[PDB]
Amino acid sequence: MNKLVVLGSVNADHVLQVPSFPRPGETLHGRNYQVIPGGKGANQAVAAARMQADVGFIACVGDDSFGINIRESFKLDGINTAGVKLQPNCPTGIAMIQVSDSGENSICISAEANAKLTAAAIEPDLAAIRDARYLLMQLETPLDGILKAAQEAKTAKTNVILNPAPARELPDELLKCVDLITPNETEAEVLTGITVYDDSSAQQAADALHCKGIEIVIITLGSKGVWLSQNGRGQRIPGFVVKATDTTAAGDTFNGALVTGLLQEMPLESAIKFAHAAAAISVTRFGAQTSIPTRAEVEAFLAEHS
Amino acid sequence: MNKLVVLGSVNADHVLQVPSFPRPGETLHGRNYQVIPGGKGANQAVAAARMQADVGFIACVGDDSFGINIRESFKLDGINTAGVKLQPNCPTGIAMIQVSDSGENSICISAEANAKLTAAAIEPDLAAIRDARYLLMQLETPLDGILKAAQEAKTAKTNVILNPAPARELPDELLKCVDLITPNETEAEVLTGITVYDDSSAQQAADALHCKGIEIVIITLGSKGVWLSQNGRGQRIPGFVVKATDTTAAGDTFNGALVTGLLQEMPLESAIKFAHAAAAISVTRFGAQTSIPTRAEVEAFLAEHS
Ligand SMILES: Nc1ncnc2c1ncn2[C@@H]1O[C@H](COP(=O)(O)OP(=O)(O)O)[C@@H](O)[C@H]1O
Ligand SMILES: Nc1ncnc2c1ncn2[C@@H]1O[C@H](COP(=O)(O)OP(=O)(O)O)[C@@H](O)[C@H]1O
Ligand SMILES: Nc1ncnc2c1ncn2[C@@H]1O[C@H](COP(=O)(O)OP(=O)(O)O)[C@@H](O)[C@H]1O
Ligand SMILES: OC[C@H]1O[C@H](O)[C@H](O)[C@@H]1O
Ligand code: NA
Ligand code: NA
């Protein structure tokens, strides 16, 4: 039984580098087309695995060559893939991504095989969810599956960590079942209606989430670090500062590393610094899973930048 | 020796429907992802092959699965692929097409393997250009290859048809070598500096091209048909009235069908009307080569509309 179970998406990222971002009327010319392993589910699982978590992944891939191959690749990163299902007659999920020279990115996804991860589909994985200490999920798979999983985790002393990405509204039945939520600035506002722009508004958004029954709130603020709130008490924990090559998967890397830090008994503020270091390194590198650093690299970073 | 040679681009069109225009930041949920074979060169060669032209294609594709596979597919279409190069360590050209529900689309294109279609690259194809009756080209590959091909054809008495798409300015050196040019309204403006408001200005645009040495000018006018000018004699030839849902391959279909009609000894005006029918069928269908009709379909359409 893995101490960490990640449930979420797997995508093939179809990525182009762009000078700027498209305007409705003109054709943008890109370069360096690459197909890169991605998906928020897989990114966070690979981040946790590389941070040396005891990690099992619950997901759906397609029966295309990409899907078969990437499921095998997860094993090489030490992920337990018992719960990664191959979906007949379905492509693996995709993302079309454009990354500018500033590191900014635009991402559009299509569910494909990810749509198959329903509540029914995770019936054989309910045991793994129970025996785990932490369950980490995002919002790139069907809501019914995410809800069932969170419900099952609460009957079995499993911490539920939700990265509510990409942004969408969520039912109270789910939020009350989440022990720690990690929205970004956009997602915090979608979830609460409270735009986050400063300390007081950060704390408003967080309080709104606390009222929804979520004990720990972490609002990620890009290069500004994060806003950590623990039932009413908020504070900014700054990140590390680096030149951005590509921020795709920065958030995923942060989440996978954070849960790993927590699992490995680092106090919450320490696990956040640890997660900041992993995420900062990933910001300096291109592509989703290709940017995710190893534990050794994260330690070296922390040794340098204390 | 093929009577028709097409020289031009090959793209994999990656198409996604999205709710809003893609912006940097939050990931957008899309839907209905498809990879459709595309590129102006391939679309025109496929159009001609489907209309049963005796056609060879000169192009560069990648050594990805898409490029390997499409070259084989072209063969099944009836296209001579001797001049189709697979470029090592290089993906096929791609167009990332994001079709927003809100009306305006986002398009990002990367040349990839298309950039390898240079003046030097087509050296082994010069014999086929000399031996053809018509050479059909567009502007989605490097100008040096286009120019080399046009010069070779000129000294061989091969008719050169240039579809000047996507729009860009062209040197007198290239235009002098063109026998028939098929700009749309936007392209006619880019080439001449003359904006096409009506018939009089369409003729203005046409005579600007005649003055660059082009005997026949066809300005396509969307739903308004075509402005034909032969050595200074202009007229409007209307198209067909249909429910247009996707004009993505309309100009490509028109050009492929036009030259095939000409190769069949249809009088020019008649070939233009025949090509209107082919293009009309295409605008009622979705995607690049997926919209391109066969000769049998065009005949049924014409029978039904007579
Ligand atoms: N420019 C940057 N420099 C250093 N660290 C960054 C940078 N951008 C993001 N990070 C790290 O990545 C995490 C996620 O940040 P963010 O980009 O806000 O994610 P999202 O795009 O989902 O909002 C941050 O908490 C921080 O650790
Ligand atoms: N702005 C654009 N929109 C759609 N496709 C484009 C665009 N620019 C280039 N392309 C490429 O051109 C092909 C679209 O066909 P196109 O050549 O535009 O047809 P038409 O001859 O009707 O203009 C697509 O298959 C795609 O690969
Ligand atoms: N709405 C339409 N209805 C019928 N035929 C059309 C329509 N739009 C384009 N066509 C056909 O497609 C041909 C391509 O011309 P045009 O549409 O101007 O080029 P493009 O759309 O590729 O820029 C036209 O000459 C005409 O035959
Ligand atoms: O967070 C980054 C990821 O979001 C999208 O799901 C892409 O697959 C990309 O890898
Ligand atoms: Na990165
Ligand atoms: Na069409």
Overview of the molecule:
Two copies of one chain form a homodimer. Chain A contains ten helices and 13 strands. In chain A, the strands form two sheets. Chain A has a nine-stranded mixed beta sheet, with helices on both faces. A four-stranded mixed beta sheet of chain A has the order 3-2-6-7. The first copy, chain A, has one domain (1-306): UDP-N-acetylmuramoyl-L-alanine:D-glutamate ligase (3-Layer(aba) Sandwich), CATH 3.40.1190. In chain A, 34% of the residues lie in helices and 25% in strands. In chain A, strand 9 (159-162), helix 5 and strand 10 form a beta-alpha-beta unit. In chain A, helix 1 (40-50) packs across helix 8 and helix 6 (185-192) crosses helix 7. With 306 residues, chain A is an alpha/beta fold. The interface between A and B is medium-sized, with 36 and 31 residues. Strand 7 (105-110) of chain A pairs parallel with strand 3 of chain B. Bound molecules: adenosine-5'-diphosphate (3 copies), alpha-D-ribofuranose (RIB) and sodium ion (2 copies). The PDB classes it as transferase. Keywords: ribose, transferase. It forms a dimeric assembly. Vibrio cholerae O395 Ribokinase complexed with Ribose, ADP and Sodium ion.
